[PDB]
Amino acid sequence: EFITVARPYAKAAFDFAVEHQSVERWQDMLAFAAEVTKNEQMAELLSGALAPETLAESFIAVAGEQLDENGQNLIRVMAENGRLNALPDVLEQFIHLRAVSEATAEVDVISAAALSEQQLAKISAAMEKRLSRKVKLNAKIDKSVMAGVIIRAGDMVIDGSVRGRLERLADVL
Amino acid sequence: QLNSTEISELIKQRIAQFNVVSEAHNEGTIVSVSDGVIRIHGLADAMQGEMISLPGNRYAIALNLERDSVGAVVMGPYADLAEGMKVKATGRILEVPVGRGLLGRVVNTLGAPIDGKGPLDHDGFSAVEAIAPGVIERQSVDQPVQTGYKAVDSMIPIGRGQRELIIGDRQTGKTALAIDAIINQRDSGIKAIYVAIGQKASTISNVVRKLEEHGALANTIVVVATASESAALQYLAPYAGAAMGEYFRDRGEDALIIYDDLSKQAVAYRQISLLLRRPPGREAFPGDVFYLHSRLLERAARVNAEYVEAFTKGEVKGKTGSLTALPIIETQAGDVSAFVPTNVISITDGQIFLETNLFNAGIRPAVNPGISVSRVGGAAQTKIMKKLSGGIRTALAQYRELAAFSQFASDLDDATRKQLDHGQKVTELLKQKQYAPMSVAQQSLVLFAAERGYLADVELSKIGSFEAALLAYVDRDHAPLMQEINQTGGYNDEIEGKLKGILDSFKATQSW
Amino acid sequence: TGKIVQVIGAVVDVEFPQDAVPRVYDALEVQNGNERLVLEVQQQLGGGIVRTIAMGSSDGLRRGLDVKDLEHPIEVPVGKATLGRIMNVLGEPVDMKGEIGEEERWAIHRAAPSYEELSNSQELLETGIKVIDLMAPFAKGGKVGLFGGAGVGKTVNMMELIRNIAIEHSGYSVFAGVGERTREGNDFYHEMTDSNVIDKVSLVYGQMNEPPGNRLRVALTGLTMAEKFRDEGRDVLLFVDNIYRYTLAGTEVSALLGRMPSAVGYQPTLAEEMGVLQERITSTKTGSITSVQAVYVPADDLTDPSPATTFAHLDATVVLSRQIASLGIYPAVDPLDSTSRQLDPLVVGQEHYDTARGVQSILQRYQELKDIIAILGMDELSEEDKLVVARARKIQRFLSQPFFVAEVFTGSPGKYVSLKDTIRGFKGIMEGEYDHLPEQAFYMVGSIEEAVEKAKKL
Amino acid sequence: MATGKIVQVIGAVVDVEFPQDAVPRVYDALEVQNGNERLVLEVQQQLGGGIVRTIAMGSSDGLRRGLDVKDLEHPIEVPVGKATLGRIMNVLGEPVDMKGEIGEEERWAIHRAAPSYEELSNSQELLETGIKVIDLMAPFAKGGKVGLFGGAGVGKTVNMMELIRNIAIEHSGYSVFAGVGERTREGNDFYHEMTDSNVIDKVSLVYGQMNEPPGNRLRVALTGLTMAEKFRDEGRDVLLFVDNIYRYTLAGTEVSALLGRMPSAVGYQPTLAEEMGVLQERITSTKTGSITSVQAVYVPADDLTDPSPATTFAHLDATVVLSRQIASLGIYPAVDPLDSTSRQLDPLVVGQEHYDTARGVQSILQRYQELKDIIAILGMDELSEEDKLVVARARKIQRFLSQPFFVAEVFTGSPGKYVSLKDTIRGFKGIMEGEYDHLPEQAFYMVGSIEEAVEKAKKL
């Protein structure tokens, strides 16, 4: 799992993208790179023991509609170190870094009942009090809560479900 | 899954331009500092074994050349360094001041004066790492190196160009024996070098004081790497001393180098290796620890006169040079099975074993005759000493065996009794006090008295006083013969008759 | 200005901006709840990461705490104001008295004195204990080491040395409690204060309950103070409670710092860590430090690398043994391993040397007879081997001595034996002039007089 | 052209990268310019795309990353045949005696397969050393291997020198001497001994000395063995003297650590037995010719039990195990009759007289060893008369083993002695059956012949 080796490439690529302001374009470039890594015929090649130069240039020939100067050179660095499989994780961490820089957050709202638009509106306002970032609410419907709303801002969770209140009470006794 | 010094701003630099410009391959930047090892990024042209210059006036040795990294060890106080400092590779391997003017000085392993007597008056510089003379450039060792201790000079001869291991436990007299051997060369024409690895500084001050009380200091170079100095300096300290010894060897002169605690060098190379993350071996020592001591000790050689003429470009003709090595090793409670002792025992030309059970029973110096051997043989002795010493070695081994056998048996037989109380008396005879080295005439005289049975009727406690009285009597009455033996080492029926007369006249007319 | 980014045991990693990264051994500072925590920098890693040892409890640290960069090493109070007081590794007062009114503070990381600055002395400094002086004489301005396993008396022997040496010493002294029992230090402090000698002793305590960083750097702090009193031109007595713990703290930290193990699981830099501390506790042409160091040996193994490398750094080494303590013989010094650099005919005189070598020769012969005694018993010995055994047993018993600090155990009154008395006694025993007394007469008696007197009492 | 580049330099191990098409094979050889000097590399492993891990055949100092490397498309090949006689060469087959070029007509590769099973030969022609204990307890055939097992300073070099004098002069054929990890002083001594003996012109010498890098010492033996195989395939009978096999394995251990091989027991390489077997199997006598081999092996700490001495025991026909204990007591040669033997000591091969004499000596000595311990407790006072005769015979027999060597006259002053097989069988049978206890114990010591033993007793 490449969670720990993806950070340097994500950070460096994001800083360079910021200096040249084409952050959205860089995200497109990385999305394209992540999808070619999932291909059945490429995922076989990436596991073979080819020398980095040959392997990279095959990938670069396949990777049309990227910028030679910058994006394809990121590809070269990752090929040297044998880390092209880190691209599906470098993409996620680049998106995280962008969300942090743009002071914008994505959070999930979960309930057994489909929420009314006024409920979602007040949720967004309250969350923007709790969180400095603006919030994009994601609606998930799950009968598990049985009632109430589960607020899931990533690792930070506020539980407002009856079932949670019940299984919390059961351990008090 | 691990990083490899791929870090954010370096990656951003490569993102801007993958084929980063040539710039200078001469220079780079420190990226890590720890325990005296630094990692450098850049230095595309750094050679393996090359000196890297650091801010201030400090250096490092490039030991690991890896894929976009150099591992280097710092030859001094490292803790002042920091990440992001620039460094430049020299063109230079490590070299040290060398010459005749080093005699009487105390220097560190970089050759800087440490005694405070002012700057050096050396004769140029020599490489610390160098190759030994080849097979066709050697000559057989035949001249003696006179130690001054009866047991050593009789049973375990040391010749010019020999490598003789001194091995034993802590506090067994190893340092004292070596330094007394230096003192005996005070008037021998052999230059002496004492290199001290990992010892505490005041001990070095104390031995230099003893070397200064006697006249030996004006004939020796002292090279010091104290316990506070970095492992690189301790590890490189023996080779600098060897590079100073090779100056005299390559110019047709004789030198004696005393490496002190070569084991405290091996610990240092181990520290460097494990800090540089190389694969460990037995007792966690690096695999190439044999190669370290092997390429150090093989520099001790005798070189033929044609090599000396070829080297000195004909300035010195017809004289062989020599470098004699006396390494010192410490055993953990005497177990020869340990890795470093077994390697150094494999490399050397002989072994002097010093035992604490002998040292505790009054037998000082505590050399064990049964397990101590010399490969050169009597070929490194003067001929008078050769005759007399031959019998001594066998007699001592056989005496030990007989002593055990006949004591627990609590028994007697006539010839065995005679042999046993001759062996006890010669064993008592080889005891000797510190800083009292004997000339070859004195040694041969006492050994003649022992071999020819004049001690057969002296009681054991009076052997020492017998020896002292004999030496004083001879030093007043028969000095021309002592001068002749000391000048020639010859042995004739005339010499034997005169020695017989001396012993007869002494034992009749004197008392002890 | 910095953030905590990893927390492994007692080791803490902190990230700093690339232009602001700390130097090695700089001191950092963190709020740990309502506490203040000091971190000492050990290594600079790549990318502004810096790796440190917590000088305090690591519990309660989150990631992401702000760390403040104090741009200097750990610095401690120093000089005449530090006298009669008890202090932390960080130089903080640990007694309940007020602030230490120090005029000066020194960094605990310093370079050792030059070879040109050193000094040598042959002056015998008499210690009351009979065995130490005869077998291993110790000179003023030198190093003495007490080697022993667990519970063999290397603390108590040092308290007798403190009592006897303080008789003829006038100047100041420093005591470093490194990784030992708190109770020993508390008892010591109250003995010092109840005898009004505390006004001349400075104490640093880093005892065995404290986290690894404290126990590692407490020793260096004590050396800083001893070096101040040396550099004022005085002569100083420095007592180290246990130097073994200092190497063991480095062992405890070493693997967490990312270093491959060496020999029996030790840190690869062991010899340099020991040497870099040992070379600055030394005398100079301006003043002299006299030091006694207790050296614990693990599992009674005198060949273990830590005790083994400690042997080389000392002038007089006294080796205690459990086998002798189990026989009742205290102080349990082994005469066949205890040694001194000062036992020379020139330094101590021919009588002092001849008596010691006779004692060693007789005892060494006693050892070689033990196997035949074990298998066959004493009646199969030679008629003078029996005499050797008798004199060796008498000598073994006369090495024993009552201590003024052992009255709490033995109940017997203590004894002080001067040099012109013990060598007379041993020379007489060796020559057989006192051979007629029984073995028990020599147990726990001060002088030969007390032995013959005790024989009159059977 | 040069097609590869150095990517790492770690001690004796050099990493080289080539284009993925032209990757050199295992045990191929590469060449690079280190400063002013040509350095040879030998390929050990192919790892990843285009990279070979290699061992340097010279000093590693001065190598940079990015140096060009050229792939010589063959293993290291050395000059063989008549042109090598009287010359000293290194691992690469270059001349180190300063007499000029070798002037060879053929060059062979030092890596090759062993003779086929079908090609081996069986013969049991006995050879006479003139040395009592060896001729008695470990008789040599022709074409077999002889191991001299010993720790430091027990007589391996003196025995090898005396054996060279006795066997080589009578051999009337070529010989090869291989110095593996040998002291340079002793190499010079041997060279001057051979030229003063005027036998140098029938011996070829290969030296890789202690100071040399691990690559040199590792491959030196294979060079000498390749020369011996060249002489064998011409149809000749040759002697191969190898001065220590242990440091072949030890150079292998130093190399193995850095090759990335996972360590094995006692710190040895995983491949120890494989490497030893690949060397020893080439040293045989085939239907076309015969190699006769004498090998010294260092046993660390006299252990005799650690893997390197253990593995080497299997390969040898004749085994002589020198013991520190016998040498320490002052008796030479230090051969232990209770651990030394040859597969030629067969009553069919040697004959009844020889066999039952040797086996009787060995039986006597074992009984002596059993009595020896409790003699310390009992003296000879509580021993029985049956014990007293046996101990007398055993003690004097042990002294009769001791022989002065022509080599060892330097150490001893006494002339070297020569004893024939029939003679020493007579003498040991003479104390076996004749039991000439008339004579003092030292009359059996270092005398050589039976006649000289009784004459020494007649003199004292």
Ligand SMILES: Nc1ncnc2c1ncn2[C@@H]1O[C@H](COP(=O)(O)OP(=O)(O)OP(=O)(O)O)[C@@H](O)[C@H]1O
């Ligand atoms: N011939 C001798 N007679 C008396 N004392 C001696 C003699 N040789 C050495 N000594 C004494 O032995 C003691 C130890 O000396 P030395 O330091 O040389 O020993 P060592 O085995 O080299 O110890 P270490 O490895 O600890 O330095 C000293 O007190 C020295 O005076």
Ligand SMILES: Nc1ncnc2c1ncn2[C@@H]1O[C@H](COP(=O)(O)OP(=O)(O)OP(=O)(O)O)[C@@H](O)[C@H]1O
């Ligand atoms: N002179 C003595 N007479 C009697 N007992 C003694 C003497 N010296 C020491 N002991 C015994 O040793 C015990 C422990 O003493 P001490 O603290 O000095 O030992 P230690 O080896 O330093 O132990 P530790 O490392 O656990 O502190 C004492 O309580 C006492 O029983």
Ligand SMILES: Nc1ncnc2c1ncn2[C@@H]1O[C@H](COP(=O)(O)OP(=O)(O)O)[C@@H](O)[C@H]1O
């Ligand atoms: N036959 C012998 N006669 C006399 N000395 C011998 C004999 N064999 C061995 N030695 C002694 O062994 C030492 C040299 O032996 P050598 O064979 O060179 O050592 P190794 O066995 O380690 O190669 C010297 O002390 C030499 O006198």
Ligand SMILES: [Mg+2]
């Ligand atoms: Mg010493």
Ligand SMILES: [Mg+2]
């Ligand atoms: Mg205690």
Ligand SMILES: [Mg+2]
């Ligand atoms: Mg040899």
